Every structure is written in C-alpha cells, then in structure tokens.
Design a protein around this motif. Structure first.
Motif, PDB file in Angstrom:
ATOM      1  N   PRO A 265      28.077 -40.072   1.917  1.00 41.27           N
ATOM      2  CA  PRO A 265      28.183 -38.815   1.124  1.00 41.27           C
ATOM      3  C   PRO A 265      29.013 -38.668  -0.063  1.00 41.27           C
ATOM      4  O   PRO A 265      28.624 -38.087  -1.051  1.00 41.27           O
TER       5      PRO A 265
ATOM      6  N   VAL B  57      34.742 -32.810  -0.324  1.00 32.24           N
ATOM      7  CA  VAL B  57      34.737 -34.215  -0.408  1.00 32.24           C
ATOM      8  C   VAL B  57      35.994 -34.401  -1.396  1.00 32.24           C
ATOM      9  O   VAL B  57      36.978 -35.278  -1.128  1.00 32.24           O
TER      10      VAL B  57
ATOM     11  N   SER C  77      23.055 -28.654  -1.530  1.00 27.61           N
ATOM     12  CA  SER C  77      22.686 -28.346  -0.205  1.00 27.61           C
ATOM     13  C   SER C  77      23.738 -28.653   0.666  1.00 27.61           C
ATOM     14  O   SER C  77      23.759 -28.016   2.033  1.00 27.61           O
ATOM     15  N   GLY C  78      24.457 -29.828   0.586  1.00 28.75           N
ATOM     16  CA  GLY C  78      25.299 -30.356   1.869  1.00 28.75           C
ATOM     17  C   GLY C  78      24.610 -31.187   2.543  1.00 28.75           C
ATOM     18  O   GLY C  78      25.041 -31.416   3.597  1.00 28.75           O
TER      19      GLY C  78
ATOM     20  N   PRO D  36      29.946 -28.485  -0.865  1.00 26.84           N
ATOM     21  CA  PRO D  36      30.144 -29.855  -0.339  1.00 26.84           C
ATOM     22  C   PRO D  36      31.153 -30.902  -1.385  1.00 26.84           C
ATOM     23  O   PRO D  36      31.641 -31.704  -0.971  1.00 26.84           O
TER      24      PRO D  36
ATOM     25  N   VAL E 184      32.907 -34.848   6.035  1.00 22.86           N
ATOM     26  CA  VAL E 184      32.762 -35.554   4.758  1.00 22.86           C
ATOM     27  C   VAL E 184      32.124 -36.946   5.141  1.00 22.86           C
ATOM     28  O   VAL E 184      31.198 -37.517   4.574  1.00 22.86           O
ATOM     29  N   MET E 185      32.461 -37.510   6.503  1.00 22.07           N
ATOM     30  CA  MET E 185      32.006 -39.228   6.706  1.00 22.07           C
ATOM     31  C   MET E 185      30.768 -38.883   7.265  1.00 22.07           C
ATOM     32  O   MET E 185      29.756 -39.890   6.960  1.00 22.07           O
ATOM     33  N   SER E 186      30.637 -38.017   8.019  1.00 24.95           N
ATOM     34  CA  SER E 186      29.193 -37.784   8.684  1.00 24.95           C
ATOM     35  C   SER E 186      28.116 -37.338   7.582  1.00 24.95           C
ATOM     36  O   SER E 186      26.855 -37.288   7.883  1.00 24.95           O
ATOM     37  N   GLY E 187      28.397 -36.446   6.445  1.00 20.09           N
ATOM     38  CA  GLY E 187      27.518 -35.749   5.606  1.00 20.09           C
ATOM     39  C   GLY E 187      26.871 -34.646   5.818  1.00 20.09           C
ATOM     40  O   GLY E 187      26.292 -34.365   5.636  1.00 20.09           O
ATOM     41  N   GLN E 188      27.653 -34.060   7.232  1.00 17.93           N
ATOM     42  CA  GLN E 188      27.035 -32.923   7.478  1.00 17.93           C
ATOM     43  C   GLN E 188      27.875 -31.725   6.772  1.00 17.93           C
ATOM     44  O   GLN E 188      28.820 -31.139   7.315  1.00 17.93           O
ATOM     45  N   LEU E 189      27.274 -31.631   5.629  1.00 21.90           N
ATOM     46  CA  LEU E 189      28.159 -30.435   4.769  1.00 21.90           C
ATOM     47  C   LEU E 189      27.462 -29.296   4.388  1.00 21.90           C
ATOM     48  O   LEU E 189      27.729 -28.528   3.474  1.00 21.90           O
ATOM     49  N   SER E 190      26.255 -29.097   5.037  1.00 20.17           N
ATOM     50  CA  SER E 190      25.576 -28.010   4.660  1.00 20.17           C
ATOM     51  C   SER E 190      25.927 -26.625   5.510  1.00 20.17           C
ATOM     52  O   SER E 190      25.426 -25.590   5.005  1.00 20.17           O
TER      53      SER E 190
END
Ligand SMILES: NC[C@@H]1O[C@H](O[C@H]2[C@@H](O)[C@H](O[C@@H]3[C@@H](O)[C@H](N)C[C@H](N)[C@H]3O[C@H]3O[C@H](CN)[C@@H](O)[C@H](O)[C@H]3N)O[C@@H]2CO)[C@H](N)[C@@H](O)[C@@H]1O
Ligand SMILES: NC[C@@H]1O[C@H](O[C@H]2[C@@H](O)[C@H](O[C@@H]3[C@@H](O)[C@H](N)C[C@H](N)[C@H]3O[C@H]3O[C@H](CN)[C@@H](O)[C@H](O)[C@H]3N)O[C@@H]2CO)[C@H](N)[C@@H](O)[C@@H]1O
Ligand SMILES: [Mg+2]
Lengths: 253, 252
Positions: free
Chosen positions: B162, A167, B213-214, A163, A212-218
């Motif tokens: 984020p 970024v 964890s992201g 993550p 990156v903007m949504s934060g869905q980095l899992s």
C-alpha cells in the motif's frame, strides 16, 4: 525497456567488480575507497534489487554521482571527498532512519587506508543532543503539519488525499521511533514492520500502522479517528520523554 | 491540542506581526518578504499553516525559522537572492510539488522588485530542463519502484505494497507535471489534478483510483496495475520522445 530483470548475487557482484575496476582506471590514486551499500552491501539483495555504490575521493570538494540503467538493471555511484561524506554522515535530518542505514551496511571492496571504517565510526558517533533536536524539529515540521492537513480534510476535503496522507503520517511516526531509538531501518520495505517492533511507542501508532500495512484505507472516518488517537499519543509521549520546547510566544525569535 | 481553526484575517494579522519582527531584527539586510502556500493564494482553509519567504542581502544567507504556538504553525525561509534564484531555476523530480511556491507569492515587503524577479526566474525555465528531469525521474524513481514491487511479488513483504503504491502514484503525478510544466496547487490536490491532465500514461488513472479510494488491500490487483502502469510508461516516453540512454554498461 522492460527491466528490472531477475539477477543473482554473483551477477550483481560481477557488475560491481566491473564498476570498481572502471573507477580505479579513471580516477586512479584519487580514489581512497569504494564500498557497496544497500541490500547488496548487506548481502540481502533480492532478485530485482538495484546496485548502490559509494566512493571516497581525495580530491578537494569532490561531489558528484553517476546513476544510470542498462534497461535491465540500475546503478547509482556517489563520489564524495572525505570531508563532504563525513559531514553528511554526522548530520541527522528527519529522515535519518531512512537515509543513514547506508553507513551501517557498507561492504568494503577497495580501501587504501581505513577510510570506510572512519565513515562508519562517524555515523555511529552522533551525540544524543543531535537526535533530541531532530526529534523536536520532526514534531513541528512533519507531525503538526500533517495534523493540520487531515483536520482540513475532515472539514473541507478532499478525502481522496486521506489514504496517501495516512501513509505519510505512518512513515513520519517511523522516523520519530527510529530517531528515538537511534536505529536505521534496513530497507524501505521493512520500515513499518521494524518500527512497530520497537518498545515505548506513542499510543495509537500500532493501530495506525494496521490500516497502512493491511491497505484497508477506504474508511475515512476510521482513519481520522486513528490519526487523532496517534496525535494524542504523540502529545503524551513527547511530554513524557522531554521532547518539548516552549511554545508560548507567537514569534520565538 | 492544536492546530486550531483560524480565519484568513487572523492569519494575515500574524503574517504582518512576523513581517514587523523580521524588519526589526534584520533591518536593512531584508530585501523582500512574501507569503506563499495556500495563504499566498488566498485559498487557505480552516487549519492551514503559514508559510513565508524572505530575500536577504547577506551573501550565502540560508536559514529558516519553523515553529508552533501550540495552536498554529509558521515556517519562514531566509535566502540570499542568488540562492533563491538558483533554486527557483532548478527542476528536480519533485518540481511539480515544490515549485508552486514561486507561483503563489503574495508580496508584503519588497525594497526592489525582488519577488518579481523570483517569479520570472521560476517561469522562464527552458524546455530541455524539463526533458532532462523526466528522463532522470524514470531512471532514478520509477525504475527503482519497479524493482521494489517485483521484489514484493516474489519475496514479500505485501505489507509494504500500500505505501509503495502511494509512492508510485505520486511519482507518476510528478512525471505528468513535468511533462505539462505545471505545479500542483496543494499537496492534497496532486493526484486529483494529475489524472485530469491529457497525455496520461496508460494504466496511471486506474492505479490512482486505488490510492484515492483507499482500496489498497488486494495485493494481486495492485501488482497487476503497477505492471500495467510501468508498461504504459514505456509507450508514453516513446510517444513523447523522452528516450532514456540504455546503451552504456558503465557511462564513465
Ligand atoms: N553522497 C553523500 C552525500 O549525499 C547527499 O545526497 C543524498 C541525497 O540527496 C541523495 O538522494 C539521491 C538523489 O539526489 C538523486 N536525485 C536520486 C538518488 N536515487 C538519490 O539517492 C538516495 O535516495 C534514494 C531514495 N530516494 C536511495 O535509494 C538511495 O540509496 C540514496 N543514495 O543521495 C544522497 C544520499 O546517499 C548530498 N549529495 C551530499 O551531502 C553528499 O554527497
Ligand atoms: N528556500 C529556498 C530554497 O529551499 C531549499 O530547501 C527546500 C526544502 O529542502 C525545504 O524543505 C523544508 C525542510 O528542509 C524542513 N526541514 C521542513 C520544512 N517544512 C520543509 O519545507 C518545505 O517542505 C514542506 C513539505 N514537506 C512544504 O509544506 C513547505 O512549504 C516547504 N517549504 O524547503 C525548501 C523549499 O522552500 C534549500 N534550503 C535551498 O535551495 C533554498 O533555501
Ligand atoms: Mg511544511
């Protein structure tokens, strides 16, 4: 210390004026100009923004800064000789789109004779070749390096770094776009929003920024696929725009 | 289509070719050549780049060659001894990330013990220098980040949260590294190594879990965790004596 606190544009400008008067009291005729930059210089400061000021000195080789907090707000004041500041304003590093917005956001509050205008003219007069060289360096020094890092993650971990690395890659892509279009981003917060609004982006950049903007980095597998797609887009984009050097030699010196 | 996978043996062959080129081109102006980074630690992975440092006799020498072959990447830094020794003794906010270089030197050419002097200088920095760097980091980085996320809370944009949370986690890792006087081994291991240290500011470990964890999409939770970490900083500095001056309205 529980600040930064909420402040208004008065409250910041009153502080700015106090600092200006202290600068003139202490350094007197050695002060050529005083300006405010950052959000306050653009008159777009928010409730919690800090205060950033720049001073042009007549003193030979002058180069110092004062950066402090009162617990409730924070100030940075840079003091530079004219030659040192103008040299810096004409330099284009990989983070130029992030650092040199300073020179396009000057609020002049003291100027003994066209100094702040000269700073602005210097920042806006950089030649095309300087941006071309900076872009070619960014591809090697940042993007190629990041590609090795995420490919290492793919084969040996650690995915806990992915993550943060994703970024960093999105930010480097934003620097690439800013150098190409010769634009400086207004704030750190708007870098990605402004980058994806530009035209002629390398393929895959929009999708990467979506993570990156949504934060869905899992989802590491989706991030790796998105990074590879952007890396492929970089190859086609740099070739199309001529940001290419000969890489056939093992040692190019 | 690179970078490609390479072995340590292949990387060392490249390093020695570059060593011979440097000695051919610059001759008696070369004081020393070393490998740093993962290859210097002999922990390079399949896709690692190659990083080399040169000490030059020329006064004011400070230049670099950084390139790719399409398949791998090399960076070679060339510095005079004083420039390198001066840099090795400076502690900036990112010292835990940058100065691992000086604890990962593999000497491949040295005409007078120069790389050993660089290592000794890097390892001999005084306690006060780290104290000053920590106080500066709180003012120049952490206080600034707090203003940025508090602005997000009241006026947006949450699309920056984020990225900002990643930045705050990294700044916290620098704080921990300065306190323990440790340089992180690699870029990838900074956060994992930081949260394993003792004397963590409260809330730092919890914040890092989102970054590692992201899971960075729950904006209210990130903002609450950032505030908790910022409060943890205020105790942590009091406990360890990193007191920041807040008494002057204008300190000049
Ligand atoms: N002042 C003009 C020129 O500045 C250069 O340094 C530049 C850069 O390293 C320096 O960075 C300084 C650091 O150092 C210092 N340790 C913390 C400080 N917040 C940071 O400030 C800079 O980085 C911040 C984000 N990270 C920005 O928010 C801020 O607007 C910017 N001034 O700020 C200068 C840009 O304003 C050189 N000193 C010299 O070429 C010349 O003096
Ligand atoms: N070399 C010793 C000293 O280095 C200083 O600069 C330091 C730093 O700004 C500089 O950063 C340089 C940049 O500039 C250049 N434009 C791209 C290059 N990949 C980057 O390299 C650095 O950052 C990378 C991560 N992003 C690291 O992976 C890499 O190992 C590191 N050398 O690398 C130097 C540390 O090795 C000063 N130049 C001078 O005080 C003296 O030369
Ligand atoms: Mg590098």
């Amino acid at each position: 210390m529980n600040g930064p606190i909420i402040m208004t544009r008065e409250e910041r400008m009153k502080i700015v004026h106090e600092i200006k008067e202290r600068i003139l009291d202490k350094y007197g005729d050695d002060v050529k100009a005083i300006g405010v930059y950052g959000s306050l210089g653009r008159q777009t400061d928010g409730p919690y923004s800090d205060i950033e000021m720049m001073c042009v000195m007549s003193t030979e080789e002058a180069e110092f800064s004062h950066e402090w907090t009162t617990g409730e707000w924070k100030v940075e004041v840079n003091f530079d000789s004219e030659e040192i500041l103008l040299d810096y304003a004409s330099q284009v590093e990989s983070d130029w789109p992030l650092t040199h917005g300073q020179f396009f956001s000057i609020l002049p509050i003291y100027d003994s004779g066209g100094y702040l205008e000269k700073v602005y003219q210097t920042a806006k007069s950089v030649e095309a070749q300087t941006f071309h060289d900076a872009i070619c360096a960014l591809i090697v020094e940042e993007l190629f390096e990041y590609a090795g890092k995420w490919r290492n993650i793919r084969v040996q971990g650690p995915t806990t770094f992915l993550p943060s690395l994703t970024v960093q890659v999105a930010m480097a892509g934003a620097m690439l776009i800013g150098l190409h279009h010769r634009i400086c981003y207004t704030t750190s917060a708007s870098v990605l929003t402004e980058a994806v609004k530009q035209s002629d982006l390398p393929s895959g950049y929009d999708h990467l920024c979506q993570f990156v903007m949504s934060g869905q980095l899992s989802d590491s597998e989706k991030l790796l696929e998105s990074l590879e797609n952007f890396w492929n887009g970089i190859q086609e984009w740099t070739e199309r725009h001529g940001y290419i050097v000969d890489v056939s030699k093992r040692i190019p010196f």
